[PDB]
Design a protein around this ligand. Structure first.
Ligand SMILES: [Zn+2]
Ligand SMILES: [Zn+2]
Ligand SMILES: [Zn+2]
Length: 187
């Protein structure tokens, strides 16, 4: 019996974690699950092959090389895609990348903006196929960094701030809109 209130799925002897609600990397579930912070192995276009349905935190996939996003000597790096860490199936990142930018451009809080933009920035780092898209994101990040420093290390004082009160806030959010449109136009 799963202890996650929003799941309560029956577990087995096999399980070191519940497959339905928990991340297959860190073996943790979220209290109020936000699907935009998760990746799921599925058979959606453009990758129709058989999938396992296993899920992980987007952040966990970015942090560990086995997912084929973080460049490593061991794993052939993918461009705009990830390896499901369970079954190995290649899945697309672009849907997730889009979602991060849509939340960023509408964000009122600085920490949301920094966090979401940083994820998009990492997801497509070193891309060849999506260069034009990501160059817009790179421009937005460089602008934001000049005001808050490294996006992942933003101070608590800046974090509680309002995006509109930043000197570059509206400019950065305009760039987020631009990046999403660029993705939509190419695809
Ligand atoms: Zn569960
Ligand atoms: Zn995780
Ligand atoms: Zn899978």
């Amino acid at each position: 019996i799963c202890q996650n209130l929003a799941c309560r799925a029956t577990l087995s002897l096999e399980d070191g974690y519940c497959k339905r609600c928990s991340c297959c990397i860190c073996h943790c579930y979220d209290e109020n699950k936000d699907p935009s912070l998760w990746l799921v192995c599925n058979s959606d276009p453009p990758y129709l092959s058989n999938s396992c349905g296993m899920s992980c935190h987007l952040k966990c996939a970015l942090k560990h090389e086995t997912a084929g996003i973080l460049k490593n000597g061991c794993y052939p790096k993918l461009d705009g895609s990830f390896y499901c860490v369970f079954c190995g199936k290649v899945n697309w990142l672009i849907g997730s990348w889009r979602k991060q930018l849509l939340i960023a451009k509408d964000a009122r809080r600085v920490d949301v903006l920094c966090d979401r933009l940083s994820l998009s920035h990492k997801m497509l780092k070193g891309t060849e196929h999506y260069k034009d898209m990501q160059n817009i994101v790179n421009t937005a990040v460089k602008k934001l960094k000049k005001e808050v420093g490294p996006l992942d290390k933003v101070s608590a004082v800046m974090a509680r701030g309002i995006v509109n009160r930043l000197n570059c806030g509206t400019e950065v959010q305009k760039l987020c809109v631009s990046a999403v449109e660029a993705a939509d136009s190419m695809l």
